[PDB]
């Protein structure tokens, strides 16, 4: 390989032999692209002229009242699509094209990745097929309509426990046979090399912009940058550019679900065991005898039963710290943002916010400059929050 498939001990290419050629092809293309200024220019054009970059960095006004905390939000919720996923899906789409591909393959759970791949495909004129867990289909009707509306073919998968987990299998099976004409657009900074690396490089503008914005507004770097961790793209997007600024703390927040002690959570990085799944060796939710288990979170977007290998690594060496936030904590953070700043955040992003609120409330006289990555908007969540609250 041209690049290192490993971050410390995590990463690698744990896939059937049949897929190595495809991965090797992809890495070659990405490397050439990276160096192609024309590529970089095209990418930058779309992000800006189509997606809406750079996103704003909002200084919270009411939420930190009575404390010495200054809270800023990276407005990824303002991105076309309403989530950070759009940035890399455009990069990947542009990449498939450079490789002379005309078909895209994707899988989805909550639906945001399906929607984002569908939109990238529609715009760049690619045929798009999306594998979906029939369980997720049933509960993500709205996302299915969006996808179809955009001319993406939605293939419902039932095999096993019709979910992302299984979605991924068919997606991978498909690609084995079609990699010649099709490109697999993986949803996060996970899976086999070079996806963890690619997805990162295509999400790193978040962090690069935050750095410039903060220096302009505060004239100093933040004390910490906080982001939620489903699979890890938004997080590494944010973190990437600050890794060498050792004075800046990196905090990734995993879904605590009902609470760790209950077992019903989605925090493999801190509460799981390293294993081999999805073509990578990383921490995951698995049974004692090695069967991969499901994550749990009020937010469907944080349902990845494992985590990107770069994160597992950053943790290992102590460069970044990982914490968990429960359903209940996320929900209060949700409501608090609405009420005080009139911003409806994704229940995903609420996990990062909830943690920052914790920092502030516990040590109210501690002076600290924080930045929370508001990865998405919560429009998609009002029904959930609704039926939770009414129920209560």
């Amino acid at each position: 390989t041209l690049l290192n498939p490993y971050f410390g001990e995590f990463g690698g290419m744990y896939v059937p032999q049949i897929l190595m050629p495809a991965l090797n092809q992809l890495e070659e293309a990405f490397v050439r692209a990276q160096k192609d200024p024309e590529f970089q220019a095209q990418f930058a054009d779309l992000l800006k002229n189509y997606a809406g970059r750079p996103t704003a960095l909002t200084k919270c006004q009411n939420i930190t009242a009575g404390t010495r905390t200054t809270l800023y939000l990276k407005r990824e919720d303002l991105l076309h699509g309403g989530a950070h996923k759009t940035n890399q899906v455009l990069g990947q789409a542009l990449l498939a094209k450079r490789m002379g591909k005309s078909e895209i393959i994707a899988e989805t759970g909550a639906g945001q990745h399906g929607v984002a791949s569908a939109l990238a495909s529609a715009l760049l004129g690619l045929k798009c097929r999306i594998y979906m867990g029939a369980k997720d289909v049933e509960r993500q009707s709205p996302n299915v309509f969006r996808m179809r509306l955009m001319g993406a073919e939605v293939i419902p998968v039932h095999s096993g426990s019709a979910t992302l987990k299984d979605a991924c299998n068919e997606a991978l099976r498909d690609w084995s046979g079609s990699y010649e004409t099709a490109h697999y657009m993986l949803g996060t900074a996970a899976g086999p090399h070079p996806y963890p690396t690619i997805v990162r490089e295509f999400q790193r503008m978040i962090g690069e912009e935050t750095k410039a914005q903060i220096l302009d507004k505060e004239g100093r770097l933040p004390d910490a940058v906080i982001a939620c961790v489903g699979g890890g793209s938004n997080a590494i997007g944010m973190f990437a550019d600050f890794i060498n600024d050792t004075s800046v703390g990196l905090i990734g927040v995993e879904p605590g679900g009902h609470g760790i002690e209950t077992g019903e959570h989605g925090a493999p990085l801190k509460h799981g065991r390293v294993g081999i799944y999805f073509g990578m060796k990383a921490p995951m939710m698995q049974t004692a005898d090695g069967q991969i288990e499901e994550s749990y979170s009020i937010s469907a977007g944080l349902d990845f039963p494992s985590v990107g290998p770069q994160h597992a690594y950053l943790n290992s060496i102590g460069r970044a710290d990982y914490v968990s936030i429960t359903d209940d904590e996320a929900l209060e953070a949700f409501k608090t943002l609405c009420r005080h700043e009139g911003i409806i955040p994704a229940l995903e992003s609420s996990h990062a916010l909830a943690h920052a609120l914790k920092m502030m409330r516990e040590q109210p006289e501690k002076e600290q400059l924080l930045v929370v990555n508001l990865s998405g908007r919560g429009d998609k969540d009002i029904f959930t929050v609704h039926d939770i609250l009414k129920a209560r």
Binding site: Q17, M20, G160, I276, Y277
Partner: protein
């Protein structure tokens, strides 16, 4: 490892090809599975390729995918698999037994420990579906230390660098899944690769004979067997009958 070398030798004197059925351990039940394996062997199977139910077989098709679900539902666990394995060996001392695993099930309790127990129960080879040659070092070495033959898949899109690697690293046999197939067998033989067994879609006697003639040392019947089980999941007595016959057929066509 020894068992394969023995098998392929005997096969040669009788100038015939090896017939290797694939089955899922504990599908559809433990005793039903055991009863099935005894039939396959009695019906003429030269060797066995056995699968351990795994949660995420990103390398298998719906046929095998459904087999696992049945096993799981049956209450099969790796641990139970190993018990079955000691039992199979106990009754059939000479038959080569290969395992089809997923990297996690192997990595779970330490790699070495995995192969240790294989050797202990009398397993001859192991195929880790999701470990390309590029990442096989630890698995290979551990296999060799416990006298276990590490099986490797040789794909259709296999280039020359891969061919040389598969030849060097593998033992027992080569799992054969553009390239004039005749040239594949050729290149392998040339590289002193372990005897190649034709694995892609072998579901009719016609195919067994072809493989042999093409230069393969035999053929692996990947899912044809799992199908029969499914088809007759309803009726057991006929599940066996259908099994006996199918195997007898495939075997006859190897001579």
């Amino acid at each position: 490892m020894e068992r394969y070398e023995n098998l392929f030798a005997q096969l040669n004197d009788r100038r015939e090809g090896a017939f290797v059925p694939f089955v899922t351990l504990g599908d559809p039940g433990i005793e039903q599975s055991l009863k099935i394996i005894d039939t396959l062997i009695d019906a003429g199977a030269d060797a066995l390729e056995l699968g351990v139910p795994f949660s995420d077989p990103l390398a298998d098709g719906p046929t095998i995918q459904n087999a696992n679900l049945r096993a799981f539902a049956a209450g099969v666990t790796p641990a139970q698999c190993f018990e079955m394995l000691a039992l199979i060996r106990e009754k059939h001392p000479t038959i080569p037994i290969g395992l089809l695993m997923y990297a996690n099930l192997v990595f779970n309790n330490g790699i070495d420990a995995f192969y240790a127990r294989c050797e202990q129960v009398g397993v001859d080879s192991v195929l880790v579906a999701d470990v390309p040659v590029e990442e096989s070092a630890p698995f290979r070495q551990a296999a060799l230390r416990h006298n276990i033959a590490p099986i490797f898949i040789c794909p259709p899109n296999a280039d020359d660098d891969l061919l040389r690697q598969v030849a060097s690293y593998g033992r027992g046999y080569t799992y054969l899944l553009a390239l004039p197939l005749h040239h594949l067998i050729e290149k392998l033989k040339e590289y002193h690769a372990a005897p190649a067994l034709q694995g892609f879609g072998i579901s009719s006697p016609e195919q067994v004979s072809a493989a042999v003639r093409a230069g393969a040392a035999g053929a692996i019947s990947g899912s044809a067997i799992v199908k029969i089980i499914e088809k007759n999941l309803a009726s057991p007595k006929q599940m066996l009958a259908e099994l006996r016959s199918f195997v007898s057929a495939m075997k006859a066509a190897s001579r």
